[PDB]
Write a protein that binds this ligand. Structure first.
Ligand SMILES: Nc1ncnc2c1ncn2[C@@H]1O[C@H](COP(=O)(O)OS(=O)(=O)O)[C@@H](O)[C@H]1O
Ligand SMILES: Nc1ncnc2c1ncn2[C@@H]1O[C@H](COP(=O)(O)OS(=O)(=O)O)[C@@H](O)[C@H]1O
Lengths: 192, 192
């Protein structure tokens, strides 16, 4: 143990470290929400870092597939990394499909109460598939991708998340980010 | 890709993200060097974070043993995590025995040239064993620990590290940290 503590890092950054865990089907707007939130927090002088499922999967998790056991390990490792970022005082935004409740719950358990903010992109499959920005649903339908979440692999929504976004429609990435920032501000995470 | 870039995070923190990779036998002073450096950088208003072999091994790497293949994975994952910290703009201090050259070299390869500073605690086994602060060498001699680095498992020193510390003796953790801080300062890593 070193003399420099988490509260020292928070004092330096004037914010509190935490994990914003963004979960949802492909196409539910996780990544655009993460980017909008990051931009908004940056402009307020707060330091964020995004752990994106796809990106981490080309580095730390390059060894993992999409078999259920590998998704569990993917989520577990991201959870541990996010905890480290939080301990460093960073507002860490994890954005992964993260389809299994038990695995997201395990990530929550790694952190002190209040430090893990589960954010659900509450968007139905039909809307996600109509967007299909990356053509993944198209690929899954054409049979190229087996066991695609929402098609032939399960997504289990959060039963008690802190924030639920996107259900209404005609709500923008920026408006949704504003809701998250408002929540963080009220919970006291935006000042030491 | 989000609009907020690494240079934006560096601008916010007034420093450059990097990996300070501290390697050496058990008892060579890695952890006291890491703590002294962290304290010193904190007092200068710079944000550091220490990834310590033992600690990470109770979380992210809780699944790994000390078999050579598991040490390789331990090092590989820490290298990827340290890269993320560097990308976040943090001065990331990795402090692991990290005994194999090929594995440390692989971590170096993950980063742009200049962003990985390999620091060797150049302290002979005999001095490390005389210190034996945690009683590990005692345990290895008594046979409790098989394949202990330096005893019955190999340590391969860096052939071309940026900084080599501790060989003289009567050099303190703080004096050694000062040398590292001087190097970082001169390389420009302590300002945006
Ligand atoms: N079978 C699949 N299901 C979902 N995503 C997949 C699949 N195969 C490849 N991918 C890709 O992997 C990305 C999702 O990765 P993650 O967010 O990390 O998933 S997770 O389920 O393990 O949390 C998708 O954007 C997509 O690009
Ligand atoms: N066989 C071993 N060799 C070295 N360290 C061990 C061994 N077994 C347990 N340990 C513990 O693990 C710590 C070292 O872990 P690491 O720094 O992560 O090692 S590394 O070789 O894989 O990089 C030691 O401080 C010690 O507490």
């Amino acid at each position: 143990e070193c003399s420099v503590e988490k509260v020292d890092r928070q004092r330096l950054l004037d914010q509190k470290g935490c994990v914003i865990w963004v979960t949802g089907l492909s196409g539910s707007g996780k990544s655009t929400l993460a980017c909008a939130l990051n931009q908004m927090l940056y402009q307020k002088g707060k330091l964020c870092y995004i752990l994106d499922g796809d990106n981490v999967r080309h580095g730390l998790n390059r060894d993992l597939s999409f078999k259920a056991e590998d998704r569990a390990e993917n989520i577990r490792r991201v959870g541990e990394v996010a905890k480290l970022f939080a301990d460093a005082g960073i507002i860490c935004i994890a954005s992964l499909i993260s389809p299994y409740r038990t695995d997201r719950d395990a990530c929550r358990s790694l952190l002190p109460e209040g430090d893990f903010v589960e954010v659900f992109m509450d968007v139905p499959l039909s809307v996600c598939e109509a967007r299909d920005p990356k053509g993944l649903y198209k690929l899954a339908r054409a049979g190229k991708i087996k066991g695609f979440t929402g098609i032939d692999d399960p997504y289990e929504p959060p039963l008690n998340c802190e924030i639920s976004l996107g259900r209404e429609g005609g709500t923008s990435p920026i408006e949704m980010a504003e809701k998250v920032v408002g929540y963080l501000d009220n919970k006291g995470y935006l000042q030491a």
